[model samples]
Target: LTLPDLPEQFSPPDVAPPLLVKLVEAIERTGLDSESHYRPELPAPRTDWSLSDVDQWDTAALADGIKSFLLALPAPLVTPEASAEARRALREAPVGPALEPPTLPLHRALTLRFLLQHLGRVARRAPALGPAVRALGATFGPLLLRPSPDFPALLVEKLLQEHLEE
Candidate 1:
């Protein structure tokens, strides 16, 4: 969708788990697993929302939500993996693609799954997540209805970079 001008600065939640927890929450709320391929969170429709709403979220915690869920599935059972095996999969995949324009959300999700497919790829370079996904949280999380396509990008980046350097 459309994003306003980017925020000047963003500090992820002060907790150990980053905004990823919330991103996953939004994805579950939107039912991305069964339908959308990106599995990105829907930015909240309201900008004035508060942390209390975040506390009450029951769907799935955003921290590693989509990643964890997909990894849990039996390999033969996962069609999305087969459908988009090229772009998404990574073996010790360096955090690339963020510099490129953000992909569509379901597409982003598919991309993210492929990245997770190769944990080694995630380990070699930026270990937790890439930079672009965090840019979404800094720019969009606080004031949007739901996270945008940028949401999953940030999520992927976070997962790949959490434990490593850029």
Candidate 2:
């Protein structure tokens, strides 16, 4: 698989990373099981350059590796300004309205939409997999979405839990 540039200052284009797509595919195949998700410690720095081991890795390894890629980004995919706007939108949203794209850049909005859809689908399809899926929120919720005092930017969380479509 082709890996994009990994420079510290490079912000990716609107499209999602190819490697992430691949890892998701791997997770879909076997990571459907929750026992192994995110419990391993594959060094992301090496995975940065040495993705040759990806095909052989367990679901957890691939999952943690996915974490590394996001953590490596130079900036939040969703900017703080956009997140603040999103938080405001969340406060006003009805029981299940979609997050406004105006509060997000095309890249950020679309990616968030895709991610929430996937996670929610997984949860709805297999209720037993909740912890593994919840682990994703546990891992990424704070990293990507900034929290407010008791607000905690529930828009993304609601979208993810509800499996909303665009």
Candidate 3:
């Protein structure tokens, strides 16, 4: 179901840190759009888990799960050109490598970032797809970005936590 009406979801992205707001819009848009059903496969529900629960998961298991899940997403969500490159990166990411961000070229990195923003916007708008996007962001975003394993979740949580709390 669409998240019940909430202020964060309706607010303009330009109001917050640039990436944070755009990512929100992007996720909502992707969810609202029909062509991009950017859903990631997930295990059985963990009804009691909180965002912080991610730390309790085995890092290797989480990474492997994320790798497979990312690989399953559409190439356009990862990049437009040399889609294989994006796939390769996901495929090759080790279980517990340094949390440093991937050393991708500038253009490619920006493209990937934009793709995420778009996906986040879409997911925000999509009722059915919201859980997967939020879950993925919560579980793998910090590891994906580097420096902090919770960064992605933090950004998404900023907009979605109110809904989540209910």
Q: Highest TM-score: which candidate?
A: 2
lDDT of 2 by residue, 55-98 (tens): 77786676676656555555655667776665666766642333
Please give, for residues 90-162, the per-residue lDDT of candidate 1 as tens digits: 3334333432223323333443344343332323323233443354334322121121344433434444454
- Misplaced by over 4 Å in model 2 are 1-15, 36-50, 94-102, 125-136, 146-153, 164-166
**Candidate whose lDDT is highest:** 2
State the C-alpha lDDT per candidate. Answer: 0.34, 0.54, 0.37
Candidate 3 TM-score over all chains jointly = 0.27
Ranking by TM-score: 2, 3, 1
lDDT at 27, model 2: 70
Return whichever of 1 and 3 wins on TM-score: 3
TM-score of 2: 0.67
Candidate 2 local Cα displacement, residue 166, angstroms: 7.7
Query: Candidate 3 on 1-166: residue-level lDDT in tens?
Result: 1111122223333222232233334334333444223323344332321224343444333433333333333231222233334334434542111111353433334434444544454455566655656664564443333224454454433323333333
lDDT of 1: 0.34
**TM-score per candidate, chains pooled:** 0.23, 0.67, 0.27
Error of 3 at 26 (Å): 13
Candidate 1, position 67, lDDT: 36
